[PDB]
Design a protein around this nucleic acid. Structure first.
Ligand SMILES: C#CCOc1ccc(C[C@H]2NC[C@H](O)[C@H]2OC(C)=O)cc1
Ligand SMILES: [K+]
Ligand SMILES: [K+]
Ligand SMILES: [K+]
Ligand SMILES: [K+]
Ligand SMILES: [Mg+2]
Ligand SMILES: [Mg+2]
Ligand SMILES: [Mg+2]
Ligand SMILES: [Mg+2]
Ligand SMILES: [Mg+2]
Ligand SMILES: [Mg+2]
Ligand SMILES: [Mg+2]
Ligand SMILES: [Mg+2]
Ligand SMILES: [Mg+2]
Ligand SMILES: [Mg+2]
Ligand SMILES: [Mg+2]
Ligand SMILES: [Mg+2]
Ligand SMILES: [Mg+2]
Ligand SMILES: [Mg+2]
Ligand SMILES: [Mg+2]
Ligand SMILES: [Mg+2]
Ligand SMILES: [Mg+2]
Ligand SMILES: [Mg+2]
Ligand SMILES: [Mg+2]
Ligand SMILES: [Mg+2]
Ligand SMILES: [Mg+2]
Ligand SMILES: [Mg+2]
Ligand SMILES: [Mg+2]
Ligand SMILES: [Mg+2]
Ligand SMILES: [Mg+2]
Ligand SMILES: [Mg+2]
Ligand SMILES: [Mg+2]
Ligand SMILES: [Mg+2]
Ligand SMILES: [Mg+2]
Ligand SMILES: [Mg+2]
Ligand SMILES: [Mg+2]
Ligand SMILES: [Mg+2]
Ligand SMILES: [Mg+2]
Ligand SMILES: [Mg+2]
Ligand SMILES: [Mg+2]
Ligand SMILES: [Mg+2]
Ligand SMILES: [Mg+2]
Ligand SMILES: [Mg+2]
Ligand SMILES: [Mg+2]
Ligand SMILES: [Mg+2]
Ligand SMILES: [Mg+2]
Ligand SMILES: [Mg+2]
Ligand SMILES: [Mg+2]
Ligand SMILES: [Mg+2]
Ligand SMILES: [Mg+2]
Ligand code: NA
Ligand code: NA
Ligand code: NA
Lengths: 178, 201, 186, 158
RNA sequence: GGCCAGAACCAGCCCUACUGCAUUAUCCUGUCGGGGAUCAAAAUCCGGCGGGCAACGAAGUGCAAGAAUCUUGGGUCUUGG
RNA sequence: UGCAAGGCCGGAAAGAAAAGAAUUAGAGGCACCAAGUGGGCCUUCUUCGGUAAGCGGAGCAGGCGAUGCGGAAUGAACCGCUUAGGGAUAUGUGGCGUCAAAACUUAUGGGCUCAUUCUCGAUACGUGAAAAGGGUGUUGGUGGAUACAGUUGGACCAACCGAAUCCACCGGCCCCGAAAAUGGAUGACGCU
RNA sequence: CGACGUCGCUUUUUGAUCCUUCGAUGUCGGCUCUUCCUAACCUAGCGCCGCAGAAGACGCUAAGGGUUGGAUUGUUCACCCACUGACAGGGAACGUGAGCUGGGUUUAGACCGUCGUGAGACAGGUUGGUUUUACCCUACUUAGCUGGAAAUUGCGAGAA
């Protein structure tokens, strides 16, 4: 399935005024389901860092950063999340994926399952593709073997939806109730 | 006897101090707020360890006194009494009332005890010691917080002892004449005021 | 998870190992043994030409991976059983009351344990041979012989558990039946 | 217990600001109040003569009566389902000239000035353009907005 | 026949089919150097330079107004003829 | 002839410009005659007494009372929606293994979890069941340390032996802490 | 085992409240009879001990079974005598009054003390003081008749 988060680049600034006639222009990287969530994350970042509110600023661009060609890669995702018990927890994780968006989307699922962290409590500091020789985790490095092979065991293969049946003769494929 | 502390845990009331309106208040169970070598200079104890509160609640003076006795007993046993200085940073200024059961009529209670109202992130105990006795301080504060209701965390301070100067910069600022010693704490000298024999650096 | 974890075992010349549906049969001289490992969910291979036994766990976490080293030990014990056998030596230790052990064919009788009048009986399965050493060599010794280590043990352990002191300070009352030597028949 | 006198609950309402104590100045005495003016009714606690009731403090009304030392002010007051026009009698020290129509008066005078300038061949001032329109932006400096590791360590005290 | 049923057509609704404009560059390629791991490679990766449209139904990205007449779609016992 | 007041006569009036520069299911005022009611209660935030209470007492605003309907199995007050008599098409809250309409157990989605007599979990409101503390259960992180290491065998320290270990701390799910009276309750079966 | 502290559980105590009942839900105790709980006294196993033996302490699984006779008191409690393997603690509308009993409590009679001018009062003492109704429906205990698999029908057809 395709990743549920897209790579957005938001460009914006404080609206010019008499005090600030030439405001600084900021470029922001964020992974969001849509550009409305992307703009919301941008103004939150602007408010908590540059002390600039959305009501006093404008967005120059909210385009999507296109994914590269799909190649099996190692992605180093710098990610952090907030919990009441422990404040902010920042971790660096390695993932196998074919795109930056897929790696970040897989990172959000990983944080949601292993640490019960939802989207709005999570900040993605950085994501990048790294070579095989800089991978530290063995669970990721095992996929760099020049001759990596494995069988497919314990696999539940479902029939085509059109051809699924409720009752089938025991040692045959003839459908009795379908 | 004494009522269980679970009846007075949450900060449900407005602050109720001992004043000219609230008379007949018993004395707090904790009177010594500084144990160990309190007279030691700031140079002597560089390491500071804090017990920080994680909840908004009330801590009775009985629990505060119990914690400092336990912490003092452990340090004296597993170290010396002259290698640490501990300060209790919570003061029981909130007076608790008891109805002391005419039912429910005219039920405003009489003073019963005192407790400290603590917030999230507030420091409860601070231990000043040398780097050699750090493991003893952590165990002493771990035992002391078992006397405390609620959740607390033991953390290592980034500052030098009981001062507001970073551990990484105290010695350099001390070697230059930029620090004024004032007993347990010290103040960084500012280039303000008249030109005197102080504030020249 | 870990993609591939495996363990390897070398099979001696005189013993053959067969695997079929997680059912391991080890045949050599002095007998043969069979183990049912259908509860393990592992990948068992035997290289007949190279005399190697391999157990593989694919995409396993810690719990499934802990089973492949257990599997190798079980097959190794079977290999040793059909080449050297297993011999457990048992000694009856007592302070005052002699422990009279009578060993008939596959039947063990224990009498006068701590002076009790009750007789303790145990029926040894036919796969394990029980013999009593002549007292002239070593006093009150019982020897269990068999191919299966699992069966040879718990025949001595059952003997040990039958002669247990009750309602007394076991630190002081040390009477009992204890295994002393675990070795091989050949 | 609690009572309802004339000046009940006015501990902070009828008090001077910090370091601003004192009786009213000459400019208050020299200020002219006329019938029909707009006034803010702000009680002066240093003049305990002709003070308004605590309700009318901070209310703006219309002068209906002028007397040697006093000012009559009509003040709207909501009671149940309607608003009553209450006439209060206060000393002149407790009223200030209201600037509530200053923006409207300037708007009227600007229109007269614009009309006169338009009438006789004068150059009208240029109309202001809206700031919400589009346009090209040339940024002199561009910076990256991101969350850094230093941000998380800086919010931890001790 | 003022009864039952089925097909035709109309008008009105309700559905589904058929899609254009804009945008990509943290991108696409070749080559050089580095780096990598191999029996030896290649690749993942980082730089320099030169070209550029990833254009197969390119993208699952912003907006789409495409006359169901052309080119005989479906329903209406959810309307009336 | 200046100020104050009441008038009269004239002039001008984007009928209120431009700068984000209002909007309106926007007929305003004035009366008369009268009914029921004057026990309330519940929730959101604020809040006083009380150890607390399905306890007593207040502020703002919704609601029940007076109101059903569609949901949370069941409930005056929670969620949705508020109601002429009917059809069609879409939804809301809530759901799609059976009971029971919907994935005839959807995907060509990723992880985590095993719970032996109140019997893991699937309870918004609903505390309408749980704490301090603890776990070498498993799965994740942070920071240090060592690398021909660490564990063994061999002679309280150093050598063979040929790979990655161990030290503290912080999470997720599970487990222990966890005892009441008729036989019983994620609604039931059951589900891994 | 556990001071100074601290976190809980329970509803076999009292208190707090005032939601139900005031055109009425029969009040304490005992007797009788059944059942349930476990925080386990005895009985079955099993750990550990400052565990030599004997006698015991502490703890775990387990409520299947058992848990007494009497003097005083209306008593519940309490206390003592005695037996025993042991004489554990509790719930069931403080189980159980159309099952009993009626000693107490709490009408009217009467005595005493204290109080009250008095009539009278007293969670002070004392004595005497009507305990009604089942033939209805369920429940339970026994006791009879009797159809019915499409659980009365379909002809609707399934054999351990
Ligand atoms: C004196 C005294 C205290 O003891 C009682 C004992 C019984 C009762 C009767 C009430 N019990 C429930 C109902 O409200 C009433 O039933 C009837 C039949 O009236 C009241 C008090
Ligand atoms: K604590
Ligand atoms: K009653
Ligand atoms: K026993
Ligand atoms: K009496
Ligand atoms: Mg208690
Ligand atoms: Mg309060
Ligand atoms: Mg005030
Ligand atoms: Mg004021
Ligand atoms: Mg290149
Ligand atoms: Mg170029
Ligand atoms: Mg698609
Ligand atoms: Mg068309
Ligand atoms: Mg039509
Ligand atoms: Mg029609
Ligand atoms: Mg309008
Ligand atoms: Mg009322
Ligand atoms: Mg309709
Ligand atoms: Mg429908
Ligand atoms: Mg269905
Ligand atoms: Mg499924
Ligand atoms: Mg709940
Ligand atoms: Mg429910
Ligand atoms: Mg809850
Ligand atoms: Mg915990
Ligand atoms: Mg654990
Ligand atoms: Mg864990
Ligand atoms: Mg862990
Ligand atoms: Mg259930
Ligand atoms: Mg459950
Ligand atoms: Mg359900
Ligand atoms: Mg009670
Ligand atoms: Mg009542
Ligand atoms: Mg009755
Ligand atoms: Mg009644
Ligand atoms: Mg009755
Ligand atoms: Mg028990
Ligand atoms: Mg029992
Ligand atoms: Mg029983
Ligand atoms: Mg009763
Ligand atoms: Mg009860
Ligand atoms: Mg009766
Ligand atoms: Mg009775
Ligand atoms: Mg009865
Ligand atoms: Mg009587
Ligand atoms: Mg008298
Ligand atoms: Mg009497
Ligand atoms: Mg009498
Ligand atoms: Mg008589
Ligand atoms: Mg029939
Ligand atoms: Na190259
Ligand atoms: Na009513
Ligand atoms: Na899944």
């Amino acid at each position: 399935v395709k990743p549920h988060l897209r790579h957005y680049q938001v460009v914006g600034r404080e609206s010019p005024s008499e005090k600030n006639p030439e405001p600084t222009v900021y470029k922001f990287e964020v992974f969001a389901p849509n550009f409305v969530v992307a703009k919301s994350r941008f103004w939150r970042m602007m408010r908590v860092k540059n002390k600039v509110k959305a009501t006093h600023g404008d967005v120059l661009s909210c385009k999507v950063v296109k994914d590269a060609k799909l190649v099996a890669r190692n992605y180093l995702v710098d990610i952090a999340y907030y919990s009441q018990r422990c404040g902010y927890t920042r971790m660096v994780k390695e993932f196998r994926d074919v795109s930056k968006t897929g790696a970040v989307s897989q990172a959000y699922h990983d944080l949601a399952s292993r640490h019960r962290a939802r989207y709005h409590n999570i900040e993605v500091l950085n994501v990048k593709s790294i070579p095989d020789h800089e991978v530290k985790h063995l669970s990721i490095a095992q996929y760099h073997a020049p001759n990596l092979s494995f069988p497919l065991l314990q696999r539940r293969t479902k029939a085509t939806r059109k051809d699924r049946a409720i009752f089938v003769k025991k040692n045959t494929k003839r459908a009795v109730v379908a | 006897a004494r009522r269980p502390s679970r009846c007075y845990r949450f900060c449900k009331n407005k602050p109720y101090p001992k004043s000219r309106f609230c008379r007949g208040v018993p004395d707090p169970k904790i009177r010594n707020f500084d144990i160990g070598r309190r007279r030691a200079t700031v140079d002597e104890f560089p390491v500071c360890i804090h017990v920080v509160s994680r909840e908004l609640e009330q801590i009775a003076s009985e629990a505060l006194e119990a914690a400092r006795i336990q912490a003092n007993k452990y340090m004296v046993k597993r170290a010396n009494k002259d290698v640490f200085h501990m300060r209790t940073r919570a003061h029981p200024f909130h007076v608790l009332r008891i109805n002391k059961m005419t039912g429910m009529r005219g039920a405003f209670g009489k003073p019963n005890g005192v407790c400290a109202r603590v917030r999230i992130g507030q420091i409860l105990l601070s231990m000043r010691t040398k780097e050699a006795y750090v493991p003893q301080a952590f165990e002493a504060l771990r035992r002391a917080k078992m006397k405390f209701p609620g959740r607390q965390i033991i953390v290592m301070s980034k500052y030098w002892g009981f001062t507001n100067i970073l551990r990484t910069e105290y010695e350099a600022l001390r070697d230059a004449g930029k620090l004024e010693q004032r007993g347990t704490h010290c103040k960084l000298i500012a280039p303000k005021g008249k030109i005197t024999m102080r504030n020249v650096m | 998870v870990k993609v591939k974890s495996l363990c390897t075992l070398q099979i001696p010349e005189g013993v053959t190992v067969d695997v079929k549906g997680r059912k391991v049969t080890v045949t050599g001289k002095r007998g043969t043994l069979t183990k049912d490992l259908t509860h393990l969910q592992l990948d068992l291979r035997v290289d007949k030409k190279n005399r190697t036994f391999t157990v593989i766990r694919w995409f396993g976490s810690k719990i499934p991976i802990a089973c492949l080293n257990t599997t190798k030990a079980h097959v190794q014990n079977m290999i040793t059983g059909v080449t050297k056998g297993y011999r457990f030596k048992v000694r009856c230790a007592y302070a005052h009351f002699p422990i009279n052990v009578s060993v008939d064919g596959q039947n063990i009788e224990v009498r006068n344990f701590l002076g009790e009048k009750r007789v303790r009986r145990q029926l040894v399965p036919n796969t394990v041979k029980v013999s009593q050493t002549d007292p002239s060599k070593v006093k009150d010794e019982i020897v269990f012989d068999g191919n299966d280590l699992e069966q040879v043990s718990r025949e001595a352990a059952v003997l040990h558990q039958m002669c247990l002191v009750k309602k007394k300070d076991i630190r002081k009352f040390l009477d009992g039946i204890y295994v002393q030597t675990k070795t091989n028949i050949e | 217990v609690h009572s309802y006198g004339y000046k009940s609950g006015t501990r902070h309402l009828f008090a001077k600001k910090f370091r601003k104590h004192g009786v009213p100045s000459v400019s208050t005495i020299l200020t002219n109040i006329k019938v029909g003016d707009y006034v803010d009714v702000v009680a002066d606690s240093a003049v305990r003569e002709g003070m308004p009731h605590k309700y009318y403090h901070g209310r703006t009304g219309i002068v209906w009566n002028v007397t040697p030392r006093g000012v009559g002010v009509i003040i709207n007051k909501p009671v149940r389902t309607r608003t009553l026009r209450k006439r209060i009698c206060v000393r002149f020290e407790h009223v200030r000239k209201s600037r509530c129509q200053e923006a409207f008066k300037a708007k009227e005078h600007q229109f007269q000035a614009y009309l006169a300038a338009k009438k006789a061949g004068k150059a009208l001032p240029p109309l202001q353009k809206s700031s919400r329109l589009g346009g090209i932006v040339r940024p002199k400096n561009v910076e990256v907005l991101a969350r850094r590791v230093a941000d998380y360590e800086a919010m931890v005290p001790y």
